[PDB]
Design a binder for these strands. Sequence first.
RNA 1: GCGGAUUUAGCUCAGUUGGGAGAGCGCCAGACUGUGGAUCUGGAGGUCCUGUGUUCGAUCCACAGAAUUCGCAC
RNA 2: GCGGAUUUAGCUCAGUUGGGAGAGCGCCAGACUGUGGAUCUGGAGGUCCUGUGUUCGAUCCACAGAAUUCGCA
Lengths: 238, 238, 238, 238
Amino acid sequence: SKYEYVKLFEKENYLLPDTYIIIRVDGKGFHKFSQFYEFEKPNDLKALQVMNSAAEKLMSKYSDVMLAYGDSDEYSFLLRKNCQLYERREMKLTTLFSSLMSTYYMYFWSQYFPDKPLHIDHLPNFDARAVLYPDFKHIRNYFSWRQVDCHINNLYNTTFWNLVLKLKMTPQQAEQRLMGTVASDKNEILFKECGVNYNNESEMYKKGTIIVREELKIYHVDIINDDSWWKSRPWLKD
Amino acid sequence: SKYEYVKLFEKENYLLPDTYIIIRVDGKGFHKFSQFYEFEKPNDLKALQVMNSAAEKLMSKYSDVMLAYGDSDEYSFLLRKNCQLYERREMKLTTLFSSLMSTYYMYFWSQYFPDKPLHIDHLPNFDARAVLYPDFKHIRNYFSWRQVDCHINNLYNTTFWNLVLKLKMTPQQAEQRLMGTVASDKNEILFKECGVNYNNESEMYKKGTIIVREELKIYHVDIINDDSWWKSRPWLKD
Amino acid sequence: SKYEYVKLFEKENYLLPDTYIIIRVDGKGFHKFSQFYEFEKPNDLKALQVMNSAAEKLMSKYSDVMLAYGDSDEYSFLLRKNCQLYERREMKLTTLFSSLMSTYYMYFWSQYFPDKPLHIDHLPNFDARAVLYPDFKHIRNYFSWRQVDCHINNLYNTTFWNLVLKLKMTPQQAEQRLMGTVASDKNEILFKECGVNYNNESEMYKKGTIIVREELKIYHVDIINDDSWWKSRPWLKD
Amino acid sequence: SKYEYVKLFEKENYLLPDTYIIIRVDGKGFHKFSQFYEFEKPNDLKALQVMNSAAEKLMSKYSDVMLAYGDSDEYSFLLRKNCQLYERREMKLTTLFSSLMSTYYMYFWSQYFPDKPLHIDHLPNFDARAVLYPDFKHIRNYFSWRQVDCHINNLYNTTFWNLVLKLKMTPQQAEQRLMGTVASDKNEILFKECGVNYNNESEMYKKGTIIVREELKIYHVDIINDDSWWKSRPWLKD
RNA sequence: GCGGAUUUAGCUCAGUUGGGAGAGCGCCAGACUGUGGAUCUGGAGGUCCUGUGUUCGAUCCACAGAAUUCGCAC
RNA sequence: GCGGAUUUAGCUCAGUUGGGAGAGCGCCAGACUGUGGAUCUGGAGGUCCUGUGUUCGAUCCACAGAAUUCGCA
């Protein structure tokens, strides 16, 4: 053909071999999304169950995924360093992960929320980015970063939404009240003013969600300081 | 934070400025997809209408998309050379496009096919790639390439399936019949042996689908040799 | 062989076809270099001829180089859109250009300065970077940028070195004297305090060096506003 | 400035952190270079001493280089995984290495060969590529690969040049003679026909050259199987 | 895109309805001698592409995903 | 992750009910002049981060998405 020459303008990027690959997918404008479909605040259980369902099915579909961690509207997938999926073409991996997460989310939404059919202008869309890590310690520190982020965001949102619902404050009022406040102050505000003991909050909300290949098992525990949890799973390293 | 340092391992790729951008999305294993949901052969109208609906909605959402061409399980989107969407980040554009096409396809499928609800193991997924073209002549030639490819492939499937249906041949028999045949030979085989006049086939089947920003208008015309069609639409160039 | 596998960690980068290529080479620490070998200030003529000789020879060797502009310790080379040199492999182009400029500079230095044999710890080194530009207008604007920067740096160096040499100021003293000063002030300082008419300085010093493929001709002219200079050379565009 | 905007078209590439970097430089058309300056065959000691001098000086100039291995017209440099030279910018590293190796080669050439002044059309140029390796085992395997390649190439050149020089053959005759020949066949040809025992060849010629930071020490030993050679130098991993 | 064929040790290839994995070259060690060549002896290396399903048991059987190659076709 | 402020001519800052965009500099040319200095005239360059609407009309207003910067950690 006299037209195929344009194919020469395409440029592929193969991700460095024998390197750990993290693919992180993130909900596009899921704040507005959470508002449109009237999500429970601070945390809506079933929506998180949809997220976990999509992630788990995806994980079941692709064996190279050793571990997955999700919270709020985000999910991180760890691919074994020796992954050869799609010859490690970055675009294939990221666009496939985003496509899969979006479609599976739509499906499981149709399963968990039949009362709230999806509207064409507020469909769940995900972006996806690939990140390379040469040593496992960086993987540990990454998931540590994500879990710390989950802890901070959950504490803030629980305090905020308890201030809004129980103390009937305005979002602006709750926002100003939390200004310059630290973890101890948020816990004290929740317990004394809202009558809520944070430590008694669901483990899933405060710790996020971990899916690990054992069998596929789901945990909601601290992985930041618990070295034995990692050490007992050496196949994560391989 | 002692963990945020891992964020430094990320690499962004900004697409060269003042360049025409083509993002092509492609259905993942849609032959098998067409089999599972028992698509009509050679061409199933309603499915193609799902594709076109999804693509048109997508084009409607992003004003930077000047032109789209789709056929079978593929769709190409032209973004104007001075586009600043997501600061011209390749990953954002591609993962977002795959996600959008996927979700819109899922939505419109429930609309056109209420009789065939989607199965979790056969959801429509799309990959996506970004290609840069510095001169409009290469864009013209690109879409020319896509239309020629559509013509050849359609001619193949229509001839094959007419050989299976009208002459009651076995797939291997029809395939053996098509060895060393060219477009003209396939046309002559269809007309003389199967009694089907190709030129009378649906225009969408023979030319594919064009969505162009005018209002958004859909065409099923030749864009390869019709220079005036392009010349009459200078806003495509800039 | 059981060791050849490491070849898979290599990454090639082919520069986008049908795009103008600019390769800019720049002297490594040529201020300290100028100090060690006792360069005349503000401008040492013979050094500039070494630069120009190296650039001209390099350009003579590779016909794809259509235009070159050099000043101080930098030089810019324009390679035509359909250049296929080293299959447009970026790395080959850049390392080759840097190696060539360094070696030719060493050679022509050995020719112009036999009195000052080069010392191993002060050899002329060059870096090299490649930049892609999709439209010729951006090429014009690039070389315009380079000539403007050349004017700025030359004016600064002449004023600075006239304040240090013609007067008896310290380099830091002159630096502080020129702080927050503009072209008008520099001109006025040269005139009133140093008794130097900037405009009467050599044209090469104020405008830089242009090498054009016509035959290779060397110019010291304005290319910023002179449209006719470019328009009279359409082969530069092709 | 209204022209500085072109600066936005540059794209820099920062190498993945915590990864071992190998920068390999290789002589451009050094077959022709070897012919032009009438190099001794198969191996010219003084030329190898020029290469080695250049490499040692370069390594001496940049403390980040932990190990270097060179042979024939190529040299490989290992940079420790946490190196921050030029912020791990690929272009700067490679073009700088090419420039340095080229200039140093010119200088030491002027020192070892006062009898053979360099001709402008045959100055020594080097290309350079950077390769990332996430694990040290790959470093060991890389240098192993290069040393094996050295063994093969040296055996070939010694057998070949003994066939042209000693048996007074034409290069094409030797080329055809070595077609389909294996190491054993080459050894027997040298031994029986040329009266040459390969094992008695200089250790530098058959093993290549190793420069290691200990002090900078030079070795001509096997590094493929001698694990202790690496193990006794743990600072290479760090 | 359509179809066939293939994926097991470092390289080339076996193998068994469906049962516990091998040979030649190459590599390392020792003896031997002409040396890293020749012969001989010894030894090392493998997620049998990645998952799933059935089964007491999968390299094999069924399905799916990835990769290699050759045909036909622009 | 949560919030404040910011993005307007090449640079630096105003900036407006909601209506018609500017200054200093920079920069091109011309007259006279020490020089493309100053001084003098004319002129250019602004998609005011990007889209939609309310409107007879949008730089400010209302919705959506993005970027720089500093806090709270």
